[PDB]
Design a protein around this ligand. Structure first.
Ligand code: HEM
Ligand SMILES: N#Cc1cc(S(=O)(=O)Nc2nccs2)ccc1Oc1ccc(Cl)cc1-c1cn[nH]c1
Length: 455
């Protein structure tokens, strides 16, 4: 009925996501680009290398647009948003969320304005540290979180506001839980399931109390944020009930946008500053480019990027090198599909190696080294690549691709516009090797001085 590709015998100290990814690369040398892992009776089809990922995710987009069971299916039911939803529900909410994130039916304030406002608020907070040793984990975490708050409810927060400090606490708790290594099964069961369920319930309740406030000023001609645009769609999809657009779907989608829209961006920014300390020649050329194209006078904008090939290469190189999410999120085939010499049955888990694409030894000669020239042709021009898949590929490609692109470019140019980067430790012996983590390539702990600008 369904002939899955060949793989090893079933059943395969701490095993982090990078350890998982390295083992997957080892098995691909033995079995080829496409192989099955069997976990007793439960199969997982692994896709290694660009050709296999491209053939499945892009060439057979609809067939590979399903979402896998990733950890444990929480009864709080997170399958009503984007990240964990499937079928018609996913198709509609994803479409709706994409267009809202592309400034459609969200008022006249652009996404860029919000990111630029936060870029200014992020610079002011870094000035407060008065050029003394700082762990940027907190400050870099507040900026992407505040961008999402602004998009969902049209309200940003002060870095000392308790309402903000509570949201971030629940988020950071959920990240710590999610980031637990493995040992066949995940490490984290001495009551961590209930805390996850509790934290998600708190975030949902908080979004729900904001949803009421918006229902007071309900107006068809004045949407100003995500809650308004969704309520307006809910009102437009009544009498055509039932709809995928409900109060609980709005709630889950909002939690999804909060979770996904904070940590990935926050971790990338933290890892970008670490690589800039370790590579002082690279930082100098970036600061040189900002001078000649933007200066110290005005705030950066997305229009500057096309005029800054070297800085664009650094942004892309940070994301290619760090390989933030080595296996993306699990996929599933939506129906029975013929993939090369195999027949994969409906609902079969599909695991994609993003490491195998981002660290391709032919597309990126010496992929293990940090080098902006991986995104530069032989003449020094920006060289875009089909292998740039940090946001994954196909129908499930990160809905926050454009936003995270804006945040990285705008927040990093603004930091390098108003500050020099001073490392406490000599960059020659400064550690960059990522810490063992269950879902992401997270950077090791470091400290730095944010010194106001000088030539
Ligand atoms: C550095 C920043 C980010 C990276 C490297 C990243 C990476 C990804 C990846 C690898 C996936 C999995 C896609 C797949 O299933 O194959 C994903 C999904 C998603 N990302 Fe991101 N993400 C980032 C920032 C964001 C932001 C800023 C937001 C929100 C506005 C966001 C919202 C999502 C959502 C909703 C999904 C679910 C897409 C779907 O399931 O249809 N992400 N992301
Ligand atoms: N991080 C994160 C994250 C965490 C959750 S949760 O299950 O902890 N519930 C939450 N609700 C609200 C906050 S936390 C849900 C979606 C999230 O997103 C990703 C999760 C895993 C992986 Cl592997 C990737 C993402 C992701 C990031 N950006 N884009 C995708």
């Amino acid at each position: 009925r369904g002939k899955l590709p060949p793989g090893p015998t079933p059943l395969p100290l701490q095993i982090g996501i990078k350890d998982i990814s390295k083992s997957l690369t080892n098995l691909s040398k033995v079995y080829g680009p496409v192989f099955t892992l069997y976990f007793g009776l439960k199969p997982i089809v692994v896709l290694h290398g660009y050709e296999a990922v491209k053939e499945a995710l892009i060439d057979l987009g609809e067939e590979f647009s399903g979402r896998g069971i990733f950890p444990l299916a929480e009864r709080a039911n997170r399958g009503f948003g984007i990240v964990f939803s499937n079928g018609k529900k996913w198709k509609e909410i994803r479409r709706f969320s994409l267009m809202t994130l592309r400034n459609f039916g969200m008022g006249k304030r652009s996404i860029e304005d919000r990111v630029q406002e936060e870029a200014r608020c992020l610079v002011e907070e870094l000035r407060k540290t008065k050029a003394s040793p700082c762990d940027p984990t907190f400050i870099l975490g507040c900026a992407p979180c505040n961008v999402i708050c602004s998009i969902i409810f049209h309200k940003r927060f002060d870095y000392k506001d308790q309402q903000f400090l509570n949201l971030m606490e629940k988020l950071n708790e959920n990240i710590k839980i999610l980031s637990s290594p493995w040992i066949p099964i995940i490490d984290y069961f001495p009551g961590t399931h209930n805390k996850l369920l509790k934290n998600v319930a708190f975030m949902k309740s908080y979004i729900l109390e904001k949803v009421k406030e918006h229902q007071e000023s309900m107006d068809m001609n004045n949407p100003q944020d995500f809650i308004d645009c969704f309520l307006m769609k809910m009102e437009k999809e009544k009498h055509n009930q039932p709809s995928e657009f409900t109060i609980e779907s709005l709630e889950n989608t909002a939690v999804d946008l909060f979770g996904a829209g904070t940590e990935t961006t926050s971790t990338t920014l933290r890892y970008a500053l670490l690589l800039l300390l370790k590579h002082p020649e690279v930082t100098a050329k970036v600061q040189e480019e900002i001078e000649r194209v933007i200066g110290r006078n005005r705030s950066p904008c997305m229009q500057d990027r096309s005029h800054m090939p070297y800085t664009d290469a650094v942004v892309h190189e940070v994301q290619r090198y760090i390989d933030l999410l080595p296996t993306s999120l699990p996929h599933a085939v939506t129906c029975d599909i013929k993939f090369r010499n195999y027949l994969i049955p409906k609902g079969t888990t599909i695991l994609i190696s993003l490491t195998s694409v981002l660290h391709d030894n032919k597309e990126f000669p010496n992929p293990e080294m940090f080098d902006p020239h991986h995104f530069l042709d032989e003449g020094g021009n920006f060289k875009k690549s089909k292998y740039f898949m940090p946001f994954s590929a196909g129908k499930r490609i990160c809905v926050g691709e454009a936003l995270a692109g804006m945040e990285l470019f705008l927040f990093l140019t603004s930091i390098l516009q108003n500050f020099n980067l001073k490392s406490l430790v000599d960059p020659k012996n400064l550690d960059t090797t990522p810490v063992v983590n269950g879902f992401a390539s997270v950077p090791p702990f470091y400290q730095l001085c944010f010194i106001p600008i000088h030539h």
